[model samples]
Target: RECCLEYFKGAIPLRKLKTWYQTSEDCSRDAIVFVTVQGRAICSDPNNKRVKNAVKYLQSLE
Candidate 1:
């Protein structure tokens, strides 16, 4: 479910194709490309339980 949401959100209502699931994610191959969204960076993984629960955290920034 999470992956679907992330993929569907690729364009509209998102302003950009901000991939929360690390654009270069491999989970096995090319691990160096694995970039972490520090300080709750925008476009960060929203599927994770932590991010979903703390979703409001980003709204306060704006």
Candidate 2:
């Protein structure tokens, strides 16, 4: 798999998000991959507040 070379800076609407997962350790940067309902992959910074909240929200659905 390829690493996330760029991260989205804006907050993505949670409703558009389907799920999320962290990038592998081998990646050049730490990132959260947020999958949208349309199956779009959005790369975001793991430390971003929006990314953190999205992850928690998705996890609660499990």
Candidate 3:
């Protein structure tokens, strides 16, 4: 057995990302992906608590 070098794009800060994806590893062409969205999500709203809550929700996905 052998190991290969690998790395991820890394976590982005302050950005809200909504991605639509479809990946398959069952009887198809081989394709692998490591996605990263690096930037900040600006909220026009002034409510800090709500923004925090929203950020919290998003982070939970990680």
Candidate 4:
């Protein structure tokens, strides 16, 4: 699927993407969207330790 090909560095994803409009699917504003090096967004709620760890797992991807 194609999204906003536009890229941003160090954007929080909460106030930046989600609050503006139909930002990336159902981005629960309380969550942290772990953006890839190439600008893909993977979302998760930071409050959940399990999801927090999952994003760490994503960082290890090739």
Candidate 5:
């Protein structure tokens, strides 16, 4: 479980987020990476329970 906060104008692009994730080792598979409509690309991991739960919750919101 890990988190970070960043702000930017306009759409929150996943490519930019991917760069940020790759820049640090702390952004591991054990944590969550949330992006509007693109969250699974960032946070999805079959072996992580947290990821599963988060994915389910996202589905509930839909």
Candidate 6:
């Protein structure tokens, strides 16, 4: 499985984000992996407000 070695420090525009998922608990850090429309995987802080909002938005698309 691919693990996030590092996280993105800044907020990614929601429009660019396509989907998201939480990282496994076995990882050193808790993170939210946001997949962009271009299919680039971005690691972000799971507790961040922007990340939470992004996750909510993505889930709504399901």
Best by TM-score: 2
Tens-digit lDDT track of model 2 for 1-62: 66798999976888899988888889878888999999999999988888888888888988
For every model shown, what is its TM-score relative to the native structure? 0.23, 0.89, 0.28, 0.33, 0.33, 0.83
List ranges where model 1 is wrong by over 4 Å.
1-45
- The 0-to-1 C-alpha lDDT of every candidate, in the order given, reads 0.32, 0.87, 0.34, 0.43, 0.40, 0.84
lDDT tens per residue, model 3, 1-62: 11113322334343435421223435143222222364322322223444344445565777
Give the clashing residue pairs of candidate 3, or none: 14-41, 15-41
Candidate 1 C-alpha lDDT tens digits along 1-62: 11222222222222322223334442332211112243223343445444453444434536
Which stretches in model 6 have alpha-carbon errors above 4 Å? none
Candidate no. 6 TM-score: 0.83
Which of the two, 2 or 4, has more TM-score? 2
Best by lDDT: 2
Clashes of 6: 0
Clashes of each: 0, 0, 2, 0, 0, 0
Candidates 1 and 3 compared: the better one by lDDT is: 3
Candidate 6's displacement at residue 16, Å, is 1.1
Error of 3 at 35 (Å): 15
Comparing 1 with 5 on TM-score, the higher-scoring candidate is: 5
Clashing pairs in 4: none
Candidate 5, residue 51: Cα displacement in angstroms equals: 0.4
Instruction: Supply the global lDDT for candidate 6.
Output: 0.84
Q: How would the candidate models be sorted by lDDT, starting from the highest? A: 2, 6, 4, 5, 3, 1
Candidate 3, residue 44: the lDDT equals: 22
lDDT of 6 by residue, 1-62 (tens): 56788888886788898888888878888888999999998998887888788888888988
